[PDB]
Amino acid sequence: NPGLFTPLQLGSLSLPNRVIMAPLTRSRTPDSVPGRLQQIYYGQRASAGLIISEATNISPTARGYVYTPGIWTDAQEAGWKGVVEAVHAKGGRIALQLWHVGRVSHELVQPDGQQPVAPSALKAEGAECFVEFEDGTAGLHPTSTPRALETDEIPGIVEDYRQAAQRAKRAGFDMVEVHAAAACLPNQFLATGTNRRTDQYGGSIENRARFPLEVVDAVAEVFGPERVGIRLTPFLELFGLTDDEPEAMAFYLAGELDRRGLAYLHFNEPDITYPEGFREQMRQRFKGGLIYCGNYDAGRAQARLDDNTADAVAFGRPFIANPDLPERFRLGAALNEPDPSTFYGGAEVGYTDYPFLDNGHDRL
Amino acid sequence: NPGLFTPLQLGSLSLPNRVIMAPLTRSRTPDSVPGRLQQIYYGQRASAGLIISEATNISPTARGYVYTPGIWTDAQEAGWKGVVEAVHAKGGRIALQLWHVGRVSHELVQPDGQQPVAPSALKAEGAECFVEFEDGTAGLHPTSTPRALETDEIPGIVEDYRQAAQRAKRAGFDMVEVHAAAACLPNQFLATGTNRRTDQYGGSIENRARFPLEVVDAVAEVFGPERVGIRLTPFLELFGLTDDEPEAMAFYLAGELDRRGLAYLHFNEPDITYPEGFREQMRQRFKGGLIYCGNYDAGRAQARLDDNTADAVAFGRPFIANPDLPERFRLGAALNEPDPSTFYGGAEVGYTDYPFLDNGHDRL
Ligand SMILES: Cc1cc2nc3c(=O)[nH]c(=O)nc-3n(C[C@H](O)[C@H](O)[C@H](O)COP(=O)(O)O)c2cc1C
Numbered sequence: 001n002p003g004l005f006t007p008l009q010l011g012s013l014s015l016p017n018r019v020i021m022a023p024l025t026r027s028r029t030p031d032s033v034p035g036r037l038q039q040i041y042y043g044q045r046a047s048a049g050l051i052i053s054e055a056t057n058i059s060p061t062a063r064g065y066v067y068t069p070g071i072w073t074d075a076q077e078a079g080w081k082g083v084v085e086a087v088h089a090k091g092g093r094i095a096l097q098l099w100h101v102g103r104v105s106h107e108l109v110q111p112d113g114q115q116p117v118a119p120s121a122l123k124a125e126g127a128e129c130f131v132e133f134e135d136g137t138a139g140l141h142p143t144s145t146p147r148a149l150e151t152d153e154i155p156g157i158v159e160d161y162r163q164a165a166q167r168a169k170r171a172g173f174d175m176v177e178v179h180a181a182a183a184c185l186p187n188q189f190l191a192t193g194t195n196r197r198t199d200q201y202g203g204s205i206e207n208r209a210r211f212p213l214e215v216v217d218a219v220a221e222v223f224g225p226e227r228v229g230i231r232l233t234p235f236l237e238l239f240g241l242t243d244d245e246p247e248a249m250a251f252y253l254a255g256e257l258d259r260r261g262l263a264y265l266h267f268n269e270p271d272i273t274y275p276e277g278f279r280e281q282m283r284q285r286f287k288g289g290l291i292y293c294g295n296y297d298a299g300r301a302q303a304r305l306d307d308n309t310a311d312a313v314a315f316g317r318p319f320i321a322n323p324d325l326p327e328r329f330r331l332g333a334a335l336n337e338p339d340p341s342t343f344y345g346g347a348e349v350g351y352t353d354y355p356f357l358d359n360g361h362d363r364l
Numbered sequence: 365n366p367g368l369f370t371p372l373q374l375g376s377l378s379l380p381n382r383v384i385m386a387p388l389t390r391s392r393t394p395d396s397v398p399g400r401l402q403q404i405y406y407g408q409r410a411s412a413g414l415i416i417s418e419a420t421n422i423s424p425t426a427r428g429y430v431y432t433p434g435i436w437t438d439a440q441e442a443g444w445k446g447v448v449e450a451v452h453a454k455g456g457r458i459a460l461q462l463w464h465v466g467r468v469s470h471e472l473v474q475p476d477g478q479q480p481v482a483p484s485a486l487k488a489e490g491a492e493c494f495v496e497f498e499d500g501t502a503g504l505h506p507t508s509t510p511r512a513l514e515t516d517e518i519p520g521i522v523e524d525y526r527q528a529a530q531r532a533k534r535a536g537f538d539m540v541e542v543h544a545a546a547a548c549l550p551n552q553f554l555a556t557g558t559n560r561r562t563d564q565y566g567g568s569i570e571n572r573a574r575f576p577l578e579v580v581d582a583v584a585e586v587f588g589p590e591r592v593g594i595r596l597t598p599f600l601e602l603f604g605l606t607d608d609e610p611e612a613m614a615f616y617l618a619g620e621l622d623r624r625g626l627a628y629l630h631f632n633e634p635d636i637t638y639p640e641g642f643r644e645q646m647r648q649r650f651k652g653g654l655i656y657c658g659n660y661d662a663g664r665a666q667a668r669l670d671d672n673t674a675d676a677v678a679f680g681r682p683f684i685a686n687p688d689l690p691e692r693f694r695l696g697a698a699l700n701e702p703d704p705s706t707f708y709g710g711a712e713v714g715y716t717d718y719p720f721l722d723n724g725h726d727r728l
């Protein structure tokens with residue numbers, strides 16, 4: 001009968017509470033190197049049961065959005081190490097979210113103007129990425145038509161994830177999260193709509209899943225599976241992705257990742273809603289941690305614990321606006337209101353400046 | 365090559381950092397029930413790798429000091445549960461320190477004026493406990509002459525610790541620490557000076573250690589050994605205790621507790637100093653966590669990590685005066701100065717009112 005403040009063993013990691021900070025792209029790293037301002041932003045949120053970092057680009061070609069950080073250079077790794085240490089000195093745990101955008105990119109953000117890469121040469125209809133124009137301004141821009149990866153290029157990409165996991169382990173991260181949730185290369189392999197491949201990487205369920213499962217095994221060699229998670233979005237159809245088989249692939253990956261001993265599966269929820277029985281099935285097929293995310297508040301999060309369908313619940317926008325979110329839940333204190341207009345880009349304002357509760361005792 | 369901000373697996377508990385909050389009696393619980401003021405005090409220090417609580421009395425007769433909390437009633441357990449939840453909502457881990465004062469007590473603090481209990485009927489020469497006089501004032505007062513426990517009373521005491529561990533597990537504590545360090549019944553059994561027993565609880569090393577090892581096994585049945593620690597003070601001779609064999613008993617207990625799979629041994633240091641080779645021997649005899657405490661600062665704590673003689677270091681007085689101690693170490697920021705005159709008794713002043721660093725961004 002766990003509450004929100006009942007510690008959870010997530011793989012081999014002890015969490016103090018079940019109020020997780022969702023991965024949140026904030027685009028505050030113009031040079032893609034995290035710095036003192038990240039140390040502050042993540043430090044302020046160190047009370048989270050776990051922090052899952054903003055999506056971080058594993059390579060130059062991995063990028064669809066400028067001002068987002070990387071984990072492919074020595075200078076990036078040292079910046080992240082500064083952030084990780086600061087999360088640790090404030091008592092928290094942080095997982096790095098490993099990102100490849102796939103076809104949700106554009107030649108303008110790509111290095112040397114390279115074409116975006118994907119399972120199949122299909123443009124994401126109506127999708128925008130975020131671009132810095134030649135004149136130094138920046139903005140949303142349509143994604144271009146990608147090239148299909150050659151069957152022989154797939155290992156190089158798996159190696160990019162492996163090497164991002166190696167920099168993560170060295171920088172001190174508690175865990176890694178494979179992003180397969182949205183505007184990402186592994187979800188493109190997974191869905192029928194975006195994957196029209198005829199090599200062993202397309203066709204069947206087992207073929208569509210092979211590339212994502214290799215990425216997972218690659219990062220689990222570095223962290224151990226008991227320190228790896230994955231984010232999935234079955235039933236979602238964002239950035240022009242469509243899928244005919246979201247339930248069967250969810251069941252297959254759950255069984256596959258369950259054998260592997262993965263720490264957790266993390267679902268970003270539909271609200272094209274889940275079928276009845278879906279949550280109960282996931283709980284039976286996967287014995288590790290199940291994290292759900294999508295418009296939760298304290299009572300709805302409790303209900304999923306009571307249901308025995310989640311072990312923990314992640315929160316996005318409320319953690320943007322409340323650095324001491326878990327404490328606000330404990331007290332039933334009113335939440336600060338998020339300001340969508342500073343979600344992305346800029347610097348301290350709408351970032352490190354939403355305030356903590358005043359308990360009447362704490363002094364700075 | 366761990367630093368102070370390198371996570372540590374302490375038994376089956378993940379710690380974010382190696383800066384531990386030492387157990388600190390503060391005597392702020394007049395009715396012995398923790399309340400909102402403890403929620404605040406321990407919450408403010410939730411960034412500690414682990415918090416070890418003020419010594420808590422396992423029973424009415426366990427007490428030598430008034431205004432210190434207990435863990436023998438339903439109302440005490442609920443107060444502690446409030447504190448533990450608040451530590452969890454601020455992202456920390458807390459261990460309850462289980463206390464029996466033994467002969468460091470007095471009929472005035474005892475219930476119904478009962479004699480203090482001990483291994484042997486020997487007064488602690490020159491020792492003072494803290495007493496509430498009939499007129500409602502309170503102060504230091506000489507300890508009285510205890511009675512020797514009957515051989516048949518020892519299990520009742522072991523059961524008191526077991527039942528305090530059961531209330532601890534139910535209240536949500538991450539771990540328990542057996543206090544055997546100072547002004548406590550298990551250290552009195554251990555030392556030659558205080559233990560002149562001729563039953564199986566005195567004479568040999570193996571007899572002097574039997575009662576303390578039963579307390580440990582009793583609390584390990586409730587928590588699992590991988591969630592239990594013990595605090596020891598070899599070489600110390602406080603509150604009139606003397607010991608002829610501190611090194612041999614330390615080596616014996618280390619081997620005994622090592623077989624048992626205990627999470628950690630926690631030493632409160634001499635400065636009658638340690639023999640050369642003592643730290644290196646402990647490291648070889650005991651494979652779990654070794655915590656040392658006694659006038660540490662950041663650099664001396666680092667040196668013990670570099671030595672491979674400690675896994676973590678605890679801090680007392682600096683955690684009284686600095687709720688964000690680990691962050692101060694990270695930055696090399698100046699520490700607040702402790703005020704010894706509000707170490708004990710009173711309420712918020714010298715308790716919840718030493719301030720955090722101001723980073724220029726955090727707002728209340
Ligand atoms: C500002 C913004 C940025 C986000 N960035 C990411 C991202 O980096 N990676 C990801 O997997 N999801 C991202 N998401 C989705 C969130 O992780 C979260 O799932 C979403 O906000 C829904 O949960 P919420 O209702 O509690 O905010 C983002 C959402 C928002 C609002």
Ligand SMILES: Cc1cc2nc3c(=O)[nH]c(=O)nc-3n(C[C@H](O)[C@H](O)[C@H](O)COP(=O)(O)O)c2cc1C
Pocket residue numbers: 386387388389390417418419461543545546595632657658659660678679680681682707708
């Ligand atoms: C205010 C005060 C209260 C203490 N209370 C306890 C106690 O409850 N239990 C215990 O084992 N040690 C207690 N100690 C010893 C501390 O846990 C710590 O070992 C001691 O202060 C030395 O470390 P330091 O130099 O960093 O403060 C106390 C020390 C002080 C200063």
